[PDB]
Amino acid sequence: MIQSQINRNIRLDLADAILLSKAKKDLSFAEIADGTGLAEAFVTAALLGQQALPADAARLVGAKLDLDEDSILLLQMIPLRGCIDDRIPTDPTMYRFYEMLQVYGTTLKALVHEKFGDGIISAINFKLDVKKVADPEGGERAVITLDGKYLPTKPF
Amino acid sequence: MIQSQINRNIRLDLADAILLSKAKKDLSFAEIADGTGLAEAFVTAALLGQQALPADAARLVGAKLDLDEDSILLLQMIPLRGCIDDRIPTDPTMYRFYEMLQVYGTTLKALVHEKFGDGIISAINFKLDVKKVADPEGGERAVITLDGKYLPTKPF
Amino acid sequence: MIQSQINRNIRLDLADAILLSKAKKDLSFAEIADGTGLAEAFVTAALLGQQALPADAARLVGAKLDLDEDSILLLQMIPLRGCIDDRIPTDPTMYRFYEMLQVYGTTLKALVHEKFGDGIISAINFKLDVKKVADPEGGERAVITLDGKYLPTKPF
Amino acid sequence: MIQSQINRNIRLDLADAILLSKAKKDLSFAEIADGTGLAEAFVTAALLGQQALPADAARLVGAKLDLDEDSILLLQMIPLRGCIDDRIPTDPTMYRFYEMLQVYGTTLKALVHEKFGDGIISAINFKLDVKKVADPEGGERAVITLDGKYLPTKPF
Amino acid sequence: MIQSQINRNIRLDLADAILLSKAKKDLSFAEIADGTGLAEAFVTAALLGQQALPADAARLVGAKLDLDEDSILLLQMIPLRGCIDDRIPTDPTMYRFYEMLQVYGTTLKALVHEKFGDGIISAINFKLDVKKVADPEGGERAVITLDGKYLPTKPF
Amino acid sequence: MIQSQINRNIRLDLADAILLSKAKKDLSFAEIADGTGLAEAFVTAALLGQQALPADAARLVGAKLDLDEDSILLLQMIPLRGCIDDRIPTDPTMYRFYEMLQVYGTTLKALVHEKFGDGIISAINFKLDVKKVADPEGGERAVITLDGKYLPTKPF
Amino acid sequence: MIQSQINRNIRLDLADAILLSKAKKDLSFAEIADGTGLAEAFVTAALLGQQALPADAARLVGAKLDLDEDSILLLQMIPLRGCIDDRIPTDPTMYRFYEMLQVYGTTLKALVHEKFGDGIISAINFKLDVKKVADPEGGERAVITLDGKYLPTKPF
Amino acid sequence: MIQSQINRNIRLDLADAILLSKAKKDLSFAEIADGTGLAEAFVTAALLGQQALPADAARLVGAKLDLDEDSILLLQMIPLRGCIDDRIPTDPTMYRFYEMLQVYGTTLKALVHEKFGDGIISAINFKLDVKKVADPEGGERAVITLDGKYLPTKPF
Amino acid sequence: MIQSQINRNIRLDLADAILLSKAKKDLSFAEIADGTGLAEAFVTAALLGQQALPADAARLVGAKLDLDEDSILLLQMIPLRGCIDDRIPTDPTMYRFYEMLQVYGTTLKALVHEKFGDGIISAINFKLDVKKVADPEGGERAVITLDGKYLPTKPF
Amino acid sequence: MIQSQINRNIRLDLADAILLSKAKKDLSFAEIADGTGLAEAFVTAALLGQQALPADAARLVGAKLDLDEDSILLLQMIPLRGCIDDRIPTDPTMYRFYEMLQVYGTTLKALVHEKFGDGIISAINFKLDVKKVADPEGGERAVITLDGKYLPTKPF
């Protein structure tokens, strides 16, 4: 894929249409990603404008959601990424993930440098997943796994 | 503990002093936390101004770091949390965790509502840890586990 | 249930249409909510894009307001919450509630930690109500009750 | 009292000193306010730089906290109010009250206009209290009462 | 009136249309307010989306400006107030009033507290008028009178 | 006077010192300005860093407040004006004047152009005063007079 | 003229239409202003939404650009001024004039107070012109002249 | 020559010291620059932290102001330029030059491209001066000349 | 030539249309620029709203992309430049170039002043290109060359 | 190196001390880096707080600049990176590199995706250098080479 976007509004407008069609068909994101060979977090992110789908997956989810030909093509374009309206989320569900950064951001830095060294944990060579588990005290917990490659910073 | 702070600069200035003492003594965060009974991410976060240490743990790390009495008291105080200087990190290592939110924030929201329902994954009833694993294609990866309670949003 | 929004403009545009119909029909929020079994503050918030209505209540309020079938479906979706245009309200009526945070925010923090411990008063396990009472000295007062669960922050 | 401040840092620096004295003396805000004749939220807000104490209460809390003469006088000055560092709190405890505004701000406006009319609920002719109660489902809740005069907006 | 707005763009778009009709009809704000019994500043503010007109005044100004019935209803709605695009005016005429705040804002605070005590001068229980007077040095001056009730901040 | 400042912190730091001395001596702004031949609002603004005092008034207020020689010189310097910490006041007393601009800013623009024409009402050739009067409904009111030269905008 | 605007987008949308007509007709701003009796900077500013044209000039440039009657009327309206999208220009050509203020802003203040006294150089009683001259070392230079009335700040 | 600064606070603190010395010695910027062969705008900007002085000029002005040897050296370093505290000036005298950009910024762009072509008028190959002239209608005017080289933007 | 834009949205909307046509036709930027005689970075920048194409190149790329006549004209106008939506990129690919300025911006300043002197490296007399090369350790690298004229800052 | 910083001010204050010592000693960055075996851009960045020096290089440059032992240790710690005071540079020399992003940011994205695919050019696996070359039309140019590894974004 060599085609890319520069205005996030195009794919994000498509995301809204996808969500409406998805709600009318009573579909889940697991169901949509089923048969694509791709993880639910990757396929979901693509629908929401933050990843590009291969052609085969794009045609599959486009059929499932009744998308027109322009929209199936748009899902394959490399996006202009950035899902937050204005830098800091207002939505409580999204905000809690930002709050984890406000509380543990420097701890993440410190422990990455202690265990790996100078450099970063990648957000590109990177996998994400969300699992629901029982809480032994009652209720449920989300176990969200961030799996990123360590890239070192060395002198040159 | 019923005492709390309102100006983050006090605990963050202490953090800078802790970090210099820690460097002079060639100490790691894992070995500072050893013997506290507490996870390294929790103890590290406390040193960096973002959690309160129980008294026994505050005295132990204070001994290792040669902290004065006011500093050992300060580590026990409930902090004014917020480790980011100005809302968005400049540091590449912490920025990548912000970028995961810019790319996957809406996917996290969508999958949380899919698997749990309306509501939030807690940043309060919450544990995190960082593990280093080998990348089968070469190098190292960080597996960062966010483990939060689901709190539902229901009508009233 | 499992469907959710990512762009607040969809439900906020619906709220504008809802307010027009409500005004044209000379309806109050109390009487739109009457018969739903849900509190006026919850139903009002849903109309204004900040909560999801159960199917039975969305159908009922949609009949009262002559909403099309897509609008009744949108009311049931889990919203992308955040009602303030740009972080700080300009409207005097909403600004006063922000001002109470500028004046008493640190007092709320201090007294919450004093009475409960480290942690938060939840905005999720949470309800509020607005009550009109007579002022003994003349005129009327609003008694706005914020009722949230204490969630402790514990070492791990 | 006709003396007032223009730079919040003077009283906020004093607040930090008060908090350290309070912690060294193992005092609660309820204990400090006992005997002043004033509500704990009012006295606490004054200590934290957001209200002015009458002379007798200033002298009393200054004895309890072993404050010097300049500090006792500062507590009686009318403050430059505003406790939030930079408009939006970073601290989770304080942030939850902001989130209440992001979710319910327009509902509070709508319900205030429906029950009272055009105008505002006052943040000046206004009392606040925080009450710890049992959660009937288990645990504890905060019942926070905002009690403000209705001021109408009428043509002229 | 119990109906209120949450999106200022609706009444502001109406204001743009009102101003065009006013310009085509060569009308002044003084002429439009004549016969309403309401001050020109109040009626003007309502046209520009910042006040609500009573029904009789809305019908009279609507006849003068040839407004449709939806527009006449909208003028009676309680607005989402806030006339400044983005917090600080760009327009020189409006900016000068902001600059008066930058220069005299702390003086206004200091003199209010000196003459009245702790508290505010209300922007709600409030009247405003603009008068043209001759400058004895040549030219003209505006005398703009801000008339607000004092509301005291008292201990509780 | 040809000397001017470029960093407001110098004169604002002086202002804090002036306020402490003023408080210790139980002085009002009205009596500090007594005998200067200058209006209380002008003298007060100079003490608070927003105007320059002539040498005679600077010595006169400097004696009343027991200011050192450098301070009396500073009060004569042309200031770097701007009393608001960060663009929008947090203090309720100053905020209300900002809110009057949010509600009536466009009304003030419209009425200025109607009565005078294109141009501005000056904040430079400008005087203000604060008067305390009875509220005929009960209580007290402030009548704040803004008196500014009309400067026309003309084609060239 | 007593008619004014409050939303800059109306005249800025007109400016875009003017620019398209001007490009299609191969006209310069000098040619458009020729015959108006007005300086090219003033007429150009009016076309771009920042000044008001007298009626004779409005009709003339309207004929040159084949504008409709609503547009010719809009050009006569007193504008809501402010041509910069979001406070700081992104465009290099416009940014250089902002950079001149970042480098020389305090020097301009200092030199104005030294030559004139306390007060301002007016942006209202003000003329601007752009002159192209040869660079004696090769190339071309712009000599831009800012010609503003000095308005003194005097005690009262 | 080759030494440069990265923190504007160091030279801006030096500027404050220079202004205090200058005020005590009753010096003007014209007299300080006298004998340097450099324009008063250039020397003044250097004192205020926005240009570098040659060694001969730096010792010369340093002797007039009784600067220590570290200060004379600092004046010769290449500065981190930027005199505005926070992007938009609060001071009325400096604000007027920003307002000229809000009013004429796009006119300056349009006339530069008309007279010269695509590209910029330089703020680096650039000179400015401030001249006082008489206003034939009474009073005084400042003529500020901005003189910058045209650098073209050409295809490659 | 002499025509220029003031609202970036016009050319940026055209960019979106170009990208859609480009993807439908399976074209690369390299192929679109082929035959123009112009570098691929310059032509691409023009398509994306940030440069002006000469007439012959505009017609060539217009034919390739099946653009209408208004669009071919628009591509020849001098743009209102600025491709970043809100100052700091959200997109990871664009953000890495901002991060190189956060890490190396003061080093670039320091080394420019050491090797060249006071002044700037031009962004106007400026060429850039992107080259794909083998990584000697495995994989691919981008070698991005910024080639700008040095403009000195000298006294006047 | 497992030690890291969380507050950039510590290393940036050290950078200012380094720059003063460097200026007093008439040293260039090239000669400070000479004998380290490290590139001038890397050593310079470390001195300015944006990289970590290995122990041998830290001791060598510490000797050259007469740094104390705490400072030599600080240069070895992994920094909290971010050299720009407030997100967008004010300094002209630094700003030109930001302007290159405003003009070419979307072109860089487009050409990276065209030549490499989805993903990023690394700012971590990354080197840069600054070279002076003669301009054949007269004067000098800077050739700044940004050399980063391509990291692909692949489906998972």
For residues C116 and D132, the answer to whether their CB atoms sit within 8 Å is yes
Nearest CA in chain I to G86: I86
For residues B6 and C106, the answer to whether their CB atoms sit within 8 Å is yes
Q: Which among G16, G23, G83 has CB closest to I73?
A: G23
List, in order, residues 6 or more apart from H60 with CB less than 8 Å away.
H35, H36
CA F83 to chain centre: 9
- Euclidean distance between the first and the last CA atom of chain C, given in angstroms as a whole number: 33
Chain J CB within 8 Å of residue I28 CB: yes
SS3 F33: helix
Q: How far is F54 from chain E (nearest CA, A)?
A: 18
J-chain residues near B19 (CB < 8 A): 3-6, 77
Q: What is the resolution of this structure in A?
A: 1.6
DSSP string, I107-143: HHHHHHHHHT-SEEEEEEEEEEEEEEEE-TTSSEEEE
Angle of helix J69-76 versus helix J55-65 axis, rounded to 10: 140
G155 to F54: CB separation less than 8 angstroms, yes or no: yes
For residues B131 and A60, the answer to whether their CB atoms sit within 8 Å is no
- Euclidean distance between the first and the last CA atom of chain H, given in angstroms as a whole number: 33
C128 sits in which H/E element: strand C119-134
For residues I94 and J106, the answer to whether their CB atoms sit within 8 Å is yes
**H touches which chains (3+ CB pairs under 8 A)?**
E, F, G, I, J
Given the residues E31, E81, E96, E141, select the one marked as catalytic: E96
Cα–Cα distances (Å) from D147 to D101, F84, F91, J23, in that order, read 16, 30, 20, 63
Cα–Cα distances (Å) from E100 to B88, E107, F91, I22, in that order, read 33, 10, 16, 54
Domain D92-152 is found in CATH 3.40.710.10 = no
DSSP string, H68-101: -HHHHHHTTSBP-----TTSS--SHHHHHHHHHH
Tokens 């802003």, residue?
A: G105
For residues H138 and G131, the answer to whether their CB atoms sit within 8 Å is no
- A122 annotated active-site: yes
Experimental technique used to determine this entry: X-ray
Angle of helix D40-47 versus helix D55-65 axis, rounded to 10: 70
Angle of helix B40-47 versus helix A92-115 axis, rounded to 10: 90
Between CA G154 and CA I18 the distance in angstroms is 59
Between CA G62 and CA G73 the distance in angstroms is 10
G110 to F153: CB separation less than 8 angstroms, yes or no: no
G149 sits in which H/E element: strand G140-152
Between CA G121 and CA G124 the distance in angstroms is 9
Q: Which of J120, B48, H128, G85 is nearest to E86 (CA)?
A: G85
Between CA H152 and CA H154 the distance in angstroms is 6
Q: Which of J88, G32, D45, C47 is nearest to E153 (CA)?
A: D45
List, in order, residues 6 or more apart from B14 with CB less than 8 Å away.
B49, B71, B74, B75
List, in order, residues 6 or more apart from C114 with CB less than 8 Å away.
B2, B4, D28, D29, D30
D-chain residues near E42 (CB < 8 A): 155-156
For residues J18 and J43, the answer to whether their CB atoms sit within 8 Å is no
Between CA E153 and CA E108 the distance in angstroms is 16
Between CA I48 and CA I25 the distance in angstroms is 17
SS3 annotation, chain F: CCCECCCHHHHHHHHHHHHHHHHHCCCCHHHHHCCCCCCHHHHHHHHCCCCCCCHHHHHHHHHHHCCCHHHHHHCCCECCCCCCCCCCCCCHHHHHHHHHHHHHHHHHHHHHHHHCCCEEEEEEEEEEEEEEEECCCCCEEEEEEEEEEEEECCCC
Tokens 């023009």, residue?
A: I46
Cα–Cα distances (Å) from H74 to G155, H58, J18, in that order, read 38, 9, 13
H106 to G50: CB separation less than 8 angstroms, yes or no: yes
- F99 annotated active-site: yes
Chain B CB within 8 Å of residue A24 CB: no
For residues F48 and E106, the answer to whether their CB atoms sit within 8 Å is yes
User: What is the helix, strand, coil percentage profile of chain H, to 5?
Assistant: 45, 20, 35
For residues A109 and B97, the answer to whether their CB atoms sit within 8 Å is no
J122 sits in which H/E element: strand J119-134
E129 CB burial (10 A radius; 0-12, 13-18, 19+): middle
Angle of helix A55-65 versus helix A40-47 axis, rounded to 10: 70
C63 CB burial (10 A radius; 0-12, 13-18, 19+): exposed
Between CA D66 and CA D21 the distance in angstroms is 8
Chain E CB within 8 Å of residue H101 CB: no
| DSSP assigned state of J4 | B
Looking at the DSSP bridge assignments, the partners of residue I81 are none
Q: Which of D21, B41, B2, B54 is nearest to B62 (CA)?
A: B54
CATH of domain I8-76: 1.10.260.40
E120 to D118: CB separation less than 8 angstroms, yes or no: no
Backbone angles phi, psi at B109, to 5 degrees: -60, -50
Nearest CA in chain H to F82: H90
Chain J CB within 8 Å of residue H151 CB: no
Q: Which of H75, E19, D123 is nearest to F96 (CA)?
A: D123
**CA atoms within a 13 Å half-sphere pointing along the CA-CB vector of D36:** 28
Tokens 């209440």, residue?
A: D100
Q: Which of E19, E44, E15 is nearest to E32 (CA)?
A: E44
A-chain residues near J151 (CB < 8 A): 122, 124-125, 151
The two tokens of residue I59 are 């017609």
D1 to E124: CB separation less than 8 angstroms, yes or no: no
Looking at the DSSP bridge assignments, the partners of residue I145 are I129, J145
How big is chain F by its Cα radius of gyration, in Å?
A: 18
A 10 A CB-CB count for I154 gives 13
Between CA B145 and CA E52 the distance in angstroms is 53
**CA atoms within a 13 Å half-sphere pointing along the CA-CB vector of J79:** 27
Q: Which among D87, D104, D115 has CB closest to C87?
A: D87
The two tokens of residue G17 are 């239409």
The two tokens of residue A14 are 């498509």
Chain H CB within 8 Å of residue F45 CB: no
Taking CA E2 as the corner, what is the angle to CA D154 and CA E8, rounded to the nearest 5 degrees?
A: 80
Counts for chain I of helices (H) and strands (E), in that order: 6, 2
A 10 A CB-CB count for F17 gives 13
A 10 A CB-CB count for E25 gives 12
Architecture of the CATH domain F8-74: Orthogonal Bundle (1.10)
SS3 B145: strand
Tokens 């970075």, residue?
A: I41
Residues of D designated as active site: 96, 99, 122
Going across the sheet that includes B140-152, the strands are A119-134, A140-152, B140-152, B119-134
Tokens 């890490």, residue?
A: I103
C138 CB burial (10 A radius; 0-12, 13-18, 19+): exposed
List, in order, residues 6 or more apart from E137 with CB less than 8 Å away.
none
C144 to D108: CB separation less than 8 angstroms, yes or no: yes
Nearest CA in chain I to B96: I92
Q: Which among E38, E118, E151 has CB closest to D78?
A: E118
H15 to F7: CB separation less than 8 angstroms, yes or no: yes
Between CA B75 and CA B65 the distance in angstroms is 12
G102 to J90: CB separation less than 8 angstroms, yes or no: yes
Q: Which among F78, F120, F155 has CB closest to G118?
A: F78
The two tokens of residue D107 are 């509902």
Strands E140-152 and J140-152: unpaired
Q: Which of B71, H7, H109 is nearest to J49 (CA)?
A: H7
Sheet strands (E) in A1-156: 119-134, 140-152
Nearest CA in chain G to J100: G92
SS3 D33: helix
List, in order, residues 6 or more apart from C129 with CB less than 8 Å away.
C39, C41, C144, C145
Nearest CA in chain C to B37: C156
**CA atoms within a 13 Å half-sphere pointing along the CA-CB vector of D34:** 6
- Decide: G and F in contact? Rule: 3+ Cβ pairs under 8 Å: yes
The two tokens of residue H130 are 């401030």
For residues F68 and F54, the answer to whether their CB atoms sit within 8 Å is no
Q: Residue ranges per domain, chain C?
A: 8-76, 92-152
Given the residues B96, B137, B140, B141, select the one marked as catalytic: B96
Backbone angles phi, psi at G5, to 5 degrees: -100, 155
| DSSP assigned state of A78 | B
> What single-letter amino acid sits at C74?
L
For residues C25 and E3, the answer to whether their CB atoms sit within 8 Å is no
Between CA D27 and CA C127 the distance in angstroms is 32
Q: Which of residues 66-95 of D touch C (CB under 8 A)?
A: 81-84, 87-89, 91-94
J62 sits in which H/E element: helix J55-65
- Euclidean distance between the first and the last CA atom of chain G, given in angstroms as a whole number: 33
Between CA B97 and CA B102 the distance in angstroms is 9
List, in order, residues 6 or more apart from D34 with CB less than 8 Å away.
none
Q: How many Å is the maximal CA-CA distance in chain B?
A: 56
A 10 A CB-CB count for E119 gives 19
CA G93 to chain centre: 15
Between CA C82 and CA D107 the distance in angstroms is 12
Backbone angles phi, psi at F78, to 5 degrees: -70, 125
**Breaks in chain C after (C-N > 2.5 angstroms):** none
Chain D CB within 8 Å of residue A103 CB: yes
DSSP string, E52-99: ---HHHHHHHHHHHT--HHHHHHTTSBP-----TTSS--SHHHHHHHH
CA F98 to chain centre: 15
Q: What is the torsional sign of CA C88, C89, C90, C94?
A: negative
